[PDB]
Design a protein around this motif. Structure first.
Motif, PDB file in Angstrom:
ATOM      1  N   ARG A  48      -9.186   4.484   3.424  1.00  0.00           N
ATOM      2  CA  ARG A  48      -8.282   3.720   3.677  1.00  0.00           C
ATOM      3  C   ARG A  48      -7.690   3.086   2.499  1.00  0.00           C
ATOM      4  O   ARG A  48      -6.278   3.239   2.020  1.00  0.00           O
ATOM      5  CB  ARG A  48      -9.223   2.134   4.625  1.00  0.00           C
ATOM      6  N   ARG A  49      -9.390   3.475   1.278  1.00  0.00           N
ATOM      7  CA  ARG A  49      -8.358   3.444  -0.067  1.00  0.00           C
ATOM      8  C   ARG A  49      -7.000   4.129  -0.190  1.00  0.00           C
ATOM      9  O   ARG A  49      -6.514   3.645  -0.918  1.00  0.00           O
ATOM     10  CB  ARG A  49      -9.801   3.120  -1.216  1.00  0.00           C
ATOM     11  N   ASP A  52      -3.771   2.864   0.913  1.00  0.00           N
ATOM     12  CA  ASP A  52      -3.425   2.139   0.136  1.00  0.00           C
ATOM     13  C   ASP A  52      -2.781   2.458  -1.249  1.00  0.00           C
ATOM     14  O   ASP A  52      -1.980   2.315  -2.228  1.00  0.00           O
ATOM     15  CB  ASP A  52      -4.783   1.447  -0.719  1.00  0.00           C
ATOM     16  N   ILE A  55       0.553   4.402  -1.016  1.00  0.00           N
ATOM     17  CA  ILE A  55       1.302   3.246  -0.866  1.00  0.00           C
ATOM     18  C   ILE A  55       1.749   2.986  -1.867  1.00  0.00           C
ATOM     19  O   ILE A  55       3.307   2.333  -2.777  1.00  0.00           O
ATOM     20  CB  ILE A  55       1.407   2.349   0.299  1.00  0.00           C
ATOM     21  N   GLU A  56       0.363   2.062  -2.848  1.00  0.00           N
ATOM     22  CA  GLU A  56       1.443   1.657  -4.158  1.00  0.00           C
ATOM     23  C   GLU A  56       2.560   2.480  -4.649  1.00  0.00           C
ATOM     24  O   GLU A  56       2.397   2.266  -5.754  1.00  0.00           O
ATOM     25  CB  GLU A  56      -0.287   1.341  -5.132  1.00  0.00           C
ATOM     26  N   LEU A  59       5.871   2.770  -3.932  1.00  0.00           N
ATOM     27  CA  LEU A  59       6.457   2.094  -4.813  1.00  0.00           C
ATOM     28  C   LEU A  59       6.810   2.372  -6.484  1.00  0.00           C
ATOM     29  O   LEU A  59       8.011   1.415  -6.496  1.00  0.00           O
ATOM     30  CB  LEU A  59       5.723   0.640  -4.896  1.00  0.00           C
ATOM     31  N   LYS A  66      11.224  -2.751  -5.535  1.00  0.00           N
ATOM     32  CA  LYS A  66       9.826  -3.783  -6.311  1.00  0.00           C
ATOM     33  C   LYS A  66      11.125  -5.112  -6.939  1.00  0.00           C
ATOM     34  O   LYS A  66      10.610  -5.168  -7.408  1.00  0.00           O
ATOM     35  CB  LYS A  66       8.943  -3.494  -6.951  1.00  0.00           C
ATOM     36  N   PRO A  68      10.451  -9.470  -4.304  1.00  0.00           N
ATOM     37  CA  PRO A  68       9.377  -8.845  -3.751  1.00  0.00           C
ATOM     38  C   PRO A  68       9.092  -9.360  -2.152  1.00  0.00           C
ATOM     39  O   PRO A  68       8.052  -8.804  -1.435  1.00  0.00           O
ATOM     40  CB  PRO A  68       8.183  -9.810  -5.019  1.00  0.00           C
ATOM     41  N   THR A  71      10.161  -6.992   0.072  1.00  0.00           N
ATOM     42  CA  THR A  71       9.321  -5.530   0.292  1.00  0.00           C
ATOM     43  C   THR A  71       7.736  -5.834   1.288  1.00  0.00           C
ATOM     44  O   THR A  71       7.807  -5.178   1.683  1.00  0.00           O
ATOM     45  CB  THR A  71       8.731  -5.327  -1.340  1.00  0.00           C
ATOM     46  N   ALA A  72       7.505  -6.949   1.314  1.00  0.00           N
ATOM     47  CA  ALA A  72       6.539  -7.230   2.258  1.00  0.00           C
ATOM     48  C   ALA A  72       6.557  -6.421   2.927  1.00  0.00           C
ATOM     49  O   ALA A  72       6.026  -6.011   3.544  1.00  0.00           O
ATOM     50  CB  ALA A  72       5.514  -8.884   1.844  1.00  0.00           C
ATOM     51  N   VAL A  75       7.043  -2.216   3.718  1.00  0.00           N
ATOM     52  CA  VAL A  75       5.412  -1.864   3.991  1.00  0.00           C
ATOM     53  C   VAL A  75       5.082  -1.560   5.203  1.00  0.00           C
ATOM     54  O   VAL A  75       4.337  -0.766   4.829  1.00  0.00           O
ATOM     55  CB  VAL A  75       4.773  -2.211   2.326  1.00  0.00           C
ATOM     56  N   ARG A 102      -4.441   6.829   7.086  1.00  0.00           N
ATOM     57  CA  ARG A 102      -4.106   5.249   8.399  1.00  0.00           C
ATOM     58  C   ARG A 102      -4.853   5.723   8.927  1.00  0.00           C
ATOM     59  O   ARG A 102      -5.717   5.457  10.003  1.00  0.00           O
ATOM     60  CB  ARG A 102      -3.195   4.210   8.066  1.00  0.00           C
ATOM     61  N   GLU A 103      -4.169   6.196   9.638  1.00  0.00           N
ATOM     62  CA  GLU A 103      -4.043   6.263  11.641  1.00  0.00           C
ATOM     63  C   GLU A 103      -5.088   7.657  11.860  1.00  0.00           C
ATOM     64  O   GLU A 103      -6.230   7.053  12.993  1.00  0.00           O
ATOM     65  CB  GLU A 103      -3.106   7.140  11.941  1.00  0.00           C
TER      66      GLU A 103
ATOM     67  N   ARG B 111      -2.223  -6.324   0.450  1.00  0.00           N
ATOM     68  CA  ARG B 111      -1.705  -5.418  -0.400  1.00  0.00           C
ATOM     69  C   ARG B 111      -0.922  -5.182  -0.007  1.00  0.00           C
ATOM     70  O   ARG B 111      -0.325  -4.132  -1.183  1.00  0.00           O
ATOM     71  CB  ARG B 111      -2.832  -3.941   1.178  1.00  0.00           C
ATOM     72  N   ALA B 115       1.103  -4.064  -3.509  1.00  0.00           N
ATOM     73  CA  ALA B 115       1.977  -2.666  -3.923  1.00  0.00           C
ATOM     74  C   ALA B 115       3.043  -3.126  -4.912  1.00  0.00           C
ATOM     75  O   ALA B 115       3.571  -2.300  -4.976  1.00  0.00           O
ATOM     76  CB  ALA B 115       1.641  -1.655  -3.389  1.00  0.00           C
ATOM     77  N   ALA B 116       3.559  -4.183  -4.394  1.00  0.00           N
ATOM     78  CA  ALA B 116       4.799  -4.617  -4.493  1.00  0.00           C
ATOM     79  C   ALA B 116       5.294  -5.243  -5.516  1.00  0.00           C
ATOM     80  O   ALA B 116       5.637  -6.106  -6.128  1.00  0.00           O
ATOM     81  CB  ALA B 116       5.372  -5.345  -3.315  1.00  0.00           C
TER      82      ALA B 116
END
Lengths: 144, 148
Positions: A48-49, A52, A55-56, A59, A66, A68, A71-72, A75, A102-103, B111, B115-116
């Protein structure tokens, strides 16, 4: 195991943040025999991390992506189930790898929760997804 | 402070959930030291809380323990973005399952803001906090009625 140790050495110079996550999975495998239920839970946390963290990086590799608040929802749309046209090639691979992790982590969580018998085989399926996704991420960063 | 009143009540209704609520409180008091680390801690704690709610759902619905194949597909539909709550669960099972999806969806949203580069992490964390507090209240109440 042997493949993860090879990837952690490559990521140490390419993406050391992700390389430390690969070393986390190696530690969970190294202590798997002590408690296989804690190793499965620890693998779910790390994947999971890792998703994450991927994805970071997408971006970060696409800074102009970016407004904002806009973008929410973007993502969330990129973490489930198209890809924006301005997304860099490396961003496409790393976004797809985040979805696969993630899956795989969610499926592994469902097998552990429901009391599925072959938990070791269920963890091996998630490990195979984590290895293959980390390989594609390392290849895309090299050509970037 | 709302979580403190909840943590006190949870130590009787469900001590494990109260433990996780106390972790959220600590991440708030120490938010001044590192907001980025406090947000990343809140995301993982809310996800752990969702994994704890799902475990309690199966515990309150022991009929699902008889078929791990169908239950694994049931939990995987809960963890996914679909979040299809089954209608044959118990009353406490339905409430806790929806609270688990609400915590996970709020964790992913926080999250996404992190990240954004939202930079306004306190506002983003307060939004995920509002979902967490309301989900914890629904869980504590449902388990209180179940025990009577």
């Amino acid at each position: 195991k042997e493949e993860l140790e090879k990837l952690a050495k490559e990521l140490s110079k390419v993406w050391p943040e992700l390389g430390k996550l690969v070393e986390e999975v190696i530690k969970l495998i190294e202590g798997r025999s002590k408690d296989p239920k804690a190793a499965v839970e620890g693998l779910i946390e790390t994947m999971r991390r890792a998703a994450d963290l991927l994805i970071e990086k997408v971006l970060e590799l696409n800074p102009a992506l970016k407004d904002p608040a806009r973008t929410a929802a973007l993502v969330e749309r990129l973490l489930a189930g198209e890809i924006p046209s301005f997304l860099s090639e490396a961003g496409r691979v790393l976004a797809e790898a985040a979805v696969a992790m993630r899956e795989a982590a969610d499926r592994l969580r469902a097998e552990l929760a429901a009391g599925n018998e072959d938990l070791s085989a269920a963890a091996d399926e998630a490990l195979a997804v984590f290895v293959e996704a980390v390989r594609r991420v390392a290849a895309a960063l090299l050509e970037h």
